[PDB]
Amino acid sequence: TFFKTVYRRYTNFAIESIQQTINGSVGFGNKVSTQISRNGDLITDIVVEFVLTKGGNGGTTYYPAEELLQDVELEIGGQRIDKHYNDWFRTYDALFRMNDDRYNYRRMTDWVNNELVGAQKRFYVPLIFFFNQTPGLALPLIALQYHEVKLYFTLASQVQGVNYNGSSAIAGAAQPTMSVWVDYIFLDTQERTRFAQLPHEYLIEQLQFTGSETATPSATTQAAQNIRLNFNHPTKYLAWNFNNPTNYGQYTALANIPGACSGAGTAAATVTTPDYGNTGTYNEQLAVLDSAKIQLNGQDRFATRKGSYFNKVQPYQSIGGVTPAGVYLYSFALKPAGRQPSGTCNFSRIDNATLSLTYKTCSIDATSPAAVLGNTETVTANTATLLTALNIYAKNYNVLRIMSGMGGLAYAN
Amino acid sequence: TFFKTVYRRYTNFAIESIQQTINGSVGFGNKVSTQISRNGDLITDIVVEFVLTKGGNGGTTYYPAEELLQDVELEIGGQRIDKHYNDWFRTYDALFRMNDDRYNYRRMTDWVNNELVGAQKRFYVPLIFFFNQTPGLALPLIALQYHEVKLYFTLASQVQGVNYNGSSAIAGAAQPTMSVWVDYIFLDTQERTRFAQLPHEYLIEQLQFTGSETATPSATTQAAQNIRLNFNHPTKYLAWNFNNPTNYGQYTALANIPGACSGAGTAAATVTTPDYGNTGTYNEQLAVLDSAKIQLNGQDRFATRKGSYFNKVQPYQSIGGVTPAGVYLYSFALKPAGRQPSGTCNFSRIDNATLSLTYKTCSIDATSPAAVLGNTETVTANTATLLTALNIYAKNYNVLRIMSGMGGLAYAN
Amino acid sequence: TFFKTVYRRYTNFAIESIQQTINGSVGFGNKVSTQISRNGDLITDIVVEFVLTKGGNGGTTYYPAEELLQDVELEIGGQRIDKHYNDWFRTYDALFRMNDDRYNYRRMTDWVNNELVGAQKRFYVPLIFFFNQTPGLALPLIALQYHEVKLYFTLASQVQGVNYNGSSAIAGAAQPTMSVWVDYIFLDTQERTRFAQLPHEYLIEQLQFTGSETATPSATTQAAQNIRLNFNHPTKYLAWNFNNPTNYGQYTALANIPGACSGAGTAAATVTTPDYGNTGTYNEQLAVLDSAKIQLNGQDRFATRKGSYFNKVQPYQSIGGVTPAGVYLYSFALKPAGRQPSGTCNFSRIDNATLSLTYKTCSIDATSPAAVLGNTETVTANTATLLTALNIYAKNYNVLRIMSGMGGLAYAN
């Protein structure tokens, strides 16, 4: 029946977001850390609060608060459970976040109101480890009595529009201010007792990353390249991008098209500098990578598909939102964004895995709007040569076993 | 298995939207009502149809059809079950509605096509009581044989862009036309019989509201204020806003910034009048409230967080969409928008509850774009002094017991 | 409990998108087909890849790749299971797709980056038959050993902005390139065995369509018209539109308003030609149809509601997104977009079904912005006379029984 719902009764509880103590000196390029205080029984969400001051004007910022959090390592009992990166967040956002939620995330990560020089704002960078994504995986502190739960952060040294303008330091730039808040759940005795005495097993996810250098060519392009993928465990999907390390989230070539370069379509237009505030694009014409395929033990896991296939279709068929050009996906799961496992590939059972790539023939004059807006599928702007860093990510499952006051991962890979 | 779904068979039924009889004289500032006719077995959605005629041009309207429905009281058997308000709808929309659905809601509530003077449109204001939100809570008329189900509406007297322009009545303004439609479900004998003989219990939600006056100060601002919260029952969350009663949904200070005031960035720019069509904003810089915390029996339910935390993070962590600046949320539930209860705080078990507030130091020259777009976290436009009304809402659960032809609420608070 | 989720273990499997062989000569106006190759055990998604070259500039294209796929027939064992159309996709998109997903779909179907003449892109048109929408209905090839699974496509002859400009062929226009890819699931022995030996039953959906000619009148308009609806089976909903066959997705009247006609609000403005790139609108003022009701065996299935009710409210109450003006919906289901049946009307049990229509009185001067942006609910632009084709669609359920190596539909209607 659709007209008489029977809601179920749950275990009584309470939530409180409690401030953490940050060990170390907060400031650009500094390594700082935190040992989660043992206030509640379980912990869920974790937010990093940053206070920054703008150094330029409209469109001079691009996810500053996000880039600021260069790395985040989650360690339990001295053991590293997972580690995220600056570029992972950007990629995660481009892939799995969407619509108003995604816009809210940008409001939390940078200036989106045309703010000017001197504007000071509060930023919120929500962590995304296994227990930060589902209360069903809430980390049980009351069960990790002899194990310390720690987070290790590394703050970027240069952040465009805050600290620097291109490669020129900005005078007067204020050192950032940081704060760490953790949400705790307080359980009622019944379940609290159960949590500290019984053994537990959690099916959690981890992030795997490998940075590589891209090829380049034009003219007789159709440059090629094979990357040996050294990943392990049952993997849900693969995500990768090609970015110019110089500019934070630049995953596509800079060009003389609106929102594609500093002062595009204008007399001041360049192609060396991006229109920071609008670094991302949906225009497939500005992304390298003509085709791609994955290979298992020397065999095609599937036939070659253009790079647009992994940017549009793979994301359409699963996680149905919209991904900016330059980010690619290949899912082994039916629902890669769902916590419930739905199809995986066990990499720790594959001797050889490879990502075979074929790039487009640059040759397009990035300074010409008519050349960029009016061209062929297999070519892109000569500016593509700057997309030198190839970042490949794999999201896998693992098992976290917690008993007798301590936890540990079932599989060490 | 993911490749062989077993759909379940349900109880046969039919839906029909049937027109209601409106008792009383329809017109601005009039109280009118309706006794639901006993056509079907259960009732779900309820829509109020309004026909209005524009009195100005582009951007002169702001959710007219919504504001028109000043109050709505749902009464059963002479007993008031719940009562919503003009400002609740605005707040509900800012918080729980999102994306295309939210845009569709605006299409149903006002002119969004740059329409001019004289444009006449059909508006649809969907009610949002417990049975209007889930067919699982469909109100069982066949079980309320001796109880009358009535709705009591109160129409606003002045609606900007329709009836008035600021405080100046608009000549020729047509009285509104109103219609009430209710969706009925017709059940097959099996279940119909079951519905009229067995006792029933419904876990429903109610709205609680308390209007208060705000503080103000600048210069040596950092004005403070504590509000005693008199709420009852297991509560899912708290939502509140500070608005200038003069302008319908103004939850933020007016300023000389695009979309922030009448003719902003222009020679005609003001700061006394809003850019009606664009009353809402995402810019945290224009909202009062620097920090806030809630207190139970003289103790901090949680540490103080800036007002941006309740506007961005609380909504990000639950109900993941995007909320305009000026609306705040503090959830006791994991999923405040879900009908299924997921965490509550029982206010009828708390002797003292308080909302402790600390405002920002206005001091900013609302007439200066460079002052508004380039400032500090703890200050806002001097225009903030107009946000004098503090509206606090609490959404709670209660039990509706229906038997022997009549219904009633389990807890009278 | 909300803090200890028990994920369920599933049947091991793998996915691979494999290219299909296209029988027949690919080219505008050609009929081509495909016999699905028997590579895997089950098949899910199916994508048609098209490579087209632009013939004009910004706003000269409107879902080209979508229109290109004029018809698609799914046949099993010589039997036609379902058949979709060009206009069904447009209507499906307007109704059930939404937000970022819907924008991604447009990226897959046409140029959205202001591309110019000569721009060549890769398009992806995802099929939407029963097994293309849910892996739970994956078509079991291993169980259809003696039945051929075939797809029959018909390519449009003229596609605005690619092949033609209005009715003028474009010289040099390249013939399209087409590719068909099917996703297969490879099952492990356990379940594979089970799939090829046990009888199966699938509750699937089909599309029903009937094209009719519209009435027209103005002045003493309020023209009327009744259409005998010849549909069959348990039907989830009805969807219909009035379009000018000349222009692909024109569901509304052309007018001298931004995005409503070629060069609107300009000296070059027309009203004979649409602003192709922006053919759709949300402005109810440009849609015909003043009111409507459905009738069963000579009786009102429900009271008459304005056309805006079926365009805004019906879609708001179910499938909550936003539908462009000109597309209408009347659902018999609680959740028409959900695969799980939730309310249906059995048309093969109704001797007479009728759609009663009443059009608006055109009379509005489509060339006048002040006339279009400032008018009454019961009138529209005189241009409405061009919306001559009435397309009515009904989505129903049926049963696909598969055993002994062959499949067939339970009900032949």
Nearest by CB: C10 against B2, B8, B45: B2
As to burial, measured by CB atoms within 10 angstroms (0-12 exposed, 13-18 middle, 19+ buried), residue C267 is exposed
Interchain CB contact of B145 with A (< 8 Å): no
Query: How near does any CA of chain C get to the CA of A354, in Å?
Result: 16
| Domain assignment of residue C254, yes or no | yes
Judging contacts by C-beta atoms under 8 Å, the chain A residues touching residue C5 are: 134, 136-137, 339
Interchain CB contact of A296 with B (< 8 Å): no
Range list of β-strands (E), A332-388: 345-346, 353-358, 361-364, 379-381
Distance CA A209, CA A230 (A): 9
Tell whether C150 and C260 lie within a shared domain.
no
Query: How near does any CA of chain A get to the CA of B137, in Å?
Result: 6
| Chain B residue with minimum CA distance to A128 | B317
Enclosing domain of residue A351:
205-396
Nearest by CB: B1 against C191, C203, C322: C191
Test A116 with B374 for CB contact under 8 angstroms: yes
Which residues, other chains included, contact A116 with Cβ-Cβ below 8 Å and sequence gap of 6+? A54, A57, A58, B370, B373, B374
Distance CA C259, CA C59 (A): 10
Interchain CB contact of C309 with B (< 8 Å): yes
| Domain assignment of residue A53, yes or no | yes
Structural domain total, chain C: 2
| Chain A residue with minimum CA distance to C46 | A317
Interchain CB contact of C10 with B (< 8 Å): yes
Test A10 with C18 for CB contact under 8 angstroms: no
| In the block, residue with structure tokens 């003509």 | A290
| Domain assignment of residue C404, yes or no | no
Contact partners for chain A, using 3 or more CB pairs closer than 8 A, are B, C
CATH number at residue B106: 2.70.9.10
Nearest by CB: A320 against C45, C51, C101: C101
| Chain B residue with minimum CA distance to C11 | B1
Query: How near does any CA of chain A get to the CA of B11, in Å?
Result: 5
Interfacial C residues in 183-212 facing B (CB < 8 Å): 185, 187, 191, 200, 203
List of long-range contacts for B276-279, beta carbons under 8 Å, 24+ apart: B276/B59, B276/B60, B276/B61, B276/B62, B276/B160, B276/B161, B276/B247, B277/B58, B277/B59, B277/B60, B277/B61, B277/B62, B278/B59, B279/B62, B279/B247, B279/B248, B279/B249, B279/B250
CATH number at residue C326: 2.70.9.20
CB pairs under 8 A between A and B: 124
- Cβ contact C354:C229 at 8 Å: yes
| Chain A residue with minimum CA distance to B300 | A16
Judging contacts by C-beta atoms under 8 Å, the chain A residues touching residue B99 are: 99-100
- Cβ contact A69:A153 at 8 Å: yes
Interchain CB contact of B219 with C (< 8 Å): no
Interchain CB contact of C342 with A (< 8 Å): yes
As to burial, measured by CB atoms within 10 angstroms (0-12 exposed, 13-18 middle, 19+ buried), residue C7 is middle
Q: Which of A198, A220, A244 is the last residue of a domain?
A: A198
Tell whether A213 and A333 lie within a shared domain.
yes
Tell whether C179 and C138 lie within a shared domain.
yes
Q: What is the DSSP letter of A309?
A: I
Judging contacts by C-beta atoms under 8 Å, the chain A residues touching residue B313 are: 47, 108, 124, 126
Query: How near does any CA of chain C get to the CA of B9, in Å?
Result: 8
Test A370 with C334 for CB contact under 8 angstroms: no
Interfacial C residues in 234-273 facing B (CB < 8 Å): 258
Tell whether C231 and C287 lie within a shared domain.
yes
Judging contacts by C-beta atoms under 8 Å, the chain B residues touching residue A121 are: 284-285, 377
Test A2 with B339 for CB contact under 8 angstroms: no
Judging contacts by C-beta atoms under 8 Å, the chain C residues touching residue B342 are: 2
Kindly list the distances between the CA atom of residue C325 and the CA atoms of A199, C130, C248, C308, in Å, as whole numbers in the listed order.
58, 27, 15, 8
| Domain assignment of residue C286, yes or no | yes
| Domain assignment of residue A347, yes or no | yes
Q: Which helix (H) or strand (E) holds B194?
A: helix B189-197
Q: Residue type for A123, please?
A: F
Interchain CB contact of A2 with C (< 8 Å): yes
Which alpha helices (H) appear in A145-218, and where do they start and end?
Answer: 189-197
- Evaluated on CA atoms B102, B103, B105, B106, the torsion sign reads positive
Residues in chain B: 413
Interfacial B residues in 51-80 facing C (CB < 8 Å): 51, 54
Q: Which of C180, C198, C216 is the last residue of a domain?
A: C198
Nearest by CB: B373 against A5, A114, A342: A114
Tell whether A188 and A217 lie within a shared domain.
no
Tell whether A138 and A263 lie within a shared domain.
no
Taking the CA atoms of chain A, what radius of gyration do you get in angstroms?
A: 23
| Chain A residue with minimum CA distance to B10 | A1
Nearest by CB: B342 against C2, C42, C258: C2
Which residues, other chains included, contact B380 with Cβ-Cβ below 8 Å and sequence gap of 6+? B253, B285, B286, B287, B288, B360, B361, B362, B364
| Domain assignment of residue C192, yes or no | yes
Test C126 with A313 for CB contact under 8 angstroms: yes
Tell whether C163 and C62 lie within a shared domain.
yes
- Cβ contact C310:C330 at 8 Å: yes
Give the per-residue SS3 of chain C. CCCCCCCCCCCCEEEEEEECCCECCCCCCCEEEEECCCCCCEEEEEEEEEEEECCCCCCCCCCHHHHHEEEEEEEECCEEEEEEEHHHHHHHHHHHCCHHHHHHHHHHHCCCCCCCCCCEEEEEEECCCHHHHCHHHCEEHHHCCCCCEEEEEEECCCCECCCEECCEECCCCCCCEEEEEEEEEEECHHHHHHHHHCCEEEEEEEEEEEEEECCCCCCCCCCEEEEECCCCCEEEEEEEEEECCCCCCCCCCCCCCCCCCCCCCCCCCCCCCCCHHHCCCCCHHHCCCCEEEEEECCEECCCCEEHHHHHHHHHHHCCCCCCCCCEEEEECCCCCCCCCCCCCEEHHHCCCEEEEEECCEEEECCCCHHHHCCCCCCEEEHHHHHCCEEEEEEEEEEEEEEECCEEEECCCC
| Domain assignment of residue C405, yes or no | no
Tell whether C185 and C215 lie within a shared domain.
no
Helix axes C99-109, A99-109, angle to 10 degrees: 100
Tell whether B186 and B314 lie within a shared domain.
no
Interchain CB contact of A224 with C (< 8 Å): no
Tell whether C139 and C244 lie within a shared domain.
no
- Cβ contact C59:C280 at 8 Å: no
Tell whether C124 and C226 lie within a shared domain.
no
Buried b (16+ CB within 10 A) or exposed e, A164-200: bbeeeebeebeebebbbbbbbbebeeebbeebbeeee
Tell whether A192 and A215 lie within a shared domain.
no
Interchain CB contact of B135 with C (< 8 Å): yes
| Domain assignment of residue B405, yes or no | no
Q: Which of B146, B172, B198 is the last residue of a domain?
A: B198
